[PDB]
Amino acid sequence: NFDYMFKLLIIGNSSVGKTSFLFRYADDSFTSAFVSTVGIDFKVKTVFKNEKRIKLQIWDTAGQERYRTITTAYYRGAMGFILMYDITNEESFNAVQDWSTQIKTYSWDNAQVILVGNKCDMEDERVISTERGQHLGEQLGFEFFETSAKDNINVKQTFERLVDIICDKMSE
Amino acid sequence: KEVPVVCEVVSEAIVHAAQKLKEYLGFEYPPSKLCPAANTLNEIFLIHFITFCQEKGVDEWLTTTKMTKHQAFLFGADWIWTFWGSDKQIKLQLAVQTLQMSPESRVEESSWKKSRFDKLEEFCNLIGEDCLGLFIIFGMPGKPKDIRGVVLDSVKSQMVRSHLPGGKAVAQFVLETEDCVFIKELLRNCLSKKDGLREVGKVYISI
Ligand SMILES: Nc1nc2c(ncn2[C@@H]2O[C@H](COP(=O)(O)OP(=O)(O)NP(=O)(O)O)[C@@H](O)[C@H]2O)c(=O)[nH]1
Ligand SMILES: [Mg+2]
């Protein structure tokens, strides 16, 4: 009772908000208790586009380098990626290029990517500007969003844009 | 370097949790249901273990992660113990799968008909050299309250000559092996330097 199934992966450095992002999209909730993800996990969610029923299998990956090998082992079959950095963390933004090459390496076939700078509620602690993020997105050929899982800003928009551009491809 | 204190506390916590768990092993109610759920046994054990460790103040060096349902399916592990060094780096991870010895539902058709044993093996391979698979058996044929342990590598050595699938090979290991090693000595050997991986040999873990 679904017309399509899209595999999406949320990747990026530790602490950028990946689990929080998925938790907000899938359960409409948020928690401040940081608990680091071991390995990988997933949730599922059904959406509708042009009368079509789409099952999203959204995988939440671990950002710690110790879990690189396992997380990249689950890239296979990915149709979509959310590459997340933290607008208050310079390191997480610097790592975006590496994350992009990892997407290209372990997911050679063309998967759509959205670049997401999370924690945009934290305006006082911003170190990455919005235009820096969208320029990096333009450089990599990715759509760009600034988001807050805490305040539920541009979460639904990110996932729905991902579904849109996945559906625009495969329509040939 | 406080290796001995955490080693001692964790081994005693395992023994304590096993003693608390023994009350629930062997329960069978014919008029309704003949087993407590595996999750229930796991949760009782983990609660007693974690409380013991908390009362002994080792939470800075040991973290217990209970796998979600999805994670238990994917990894073949029911929980993971992570040991931290004074440099706040990971020294050792124990991926633990429990057995009795007397599923996914959110995945479309893939090649996930692999057994729990092989999924644990693959998980430990993917994590790396300092991750050890460990089986804990709650109950034996004729000894429902007996709790026993086996390291994954020992089972591998046994199947080299015995040619059985992993799941059955663990049971035959705990049924044929009479030599044992106490959990404390194992804990010491895997933490002073990561040696226990290809060291334990033809023993089970006495709890
Ligand atoms: N202000 C703010 N904090 C956020 C936001 N999203 C997550 N956080 C906080 O950032 C911390 C890390 O969140 P978490 O989702 O676990 O990040 P992660 O990417 O999953 N870490 P890991 O890769 O180790 O699993 C938590 O304290 C969480 O509350 C956000 O949009 N705004
Ligand atoms: Mg996480």
Numbering used by the authors:
A (entry chain B): 26 to 197
B (entry chain A): 15 to 116, 131 to 235
Passage from the reporting paper:
One such Rab15 effector is Rep15, which is known to have a role in receptor recycling from the endocytic recycling compartment but otherwise remains poorly characterized. We find that Rep15 adopts a globular structure that is distinct from other reported Rab15, Rab3 and Rab34 effectors. Detailed biochemical studies reveal that Rep15 is selective for Rab15, Rab3 paralogs and Rab34 and does not bind to other evolutionarily similar Rab GTPases.
The structure is composed of one Rep15:Rab3CGppNHp_Q222H_10-227 complex per asymmetric unit. Rep15 is composed of 7α-helices and 7β-strands. Similar to all known Rab:effector complexes, switch I, switch II and the interswitch regions of Rab3C are at the interface with the effector. They interact with the α3 and α4 helices of Rep15, constituting the primary binding site, with a second site being composed of a loop (residues 115 to 145), ß2 and β3 of Rep15.
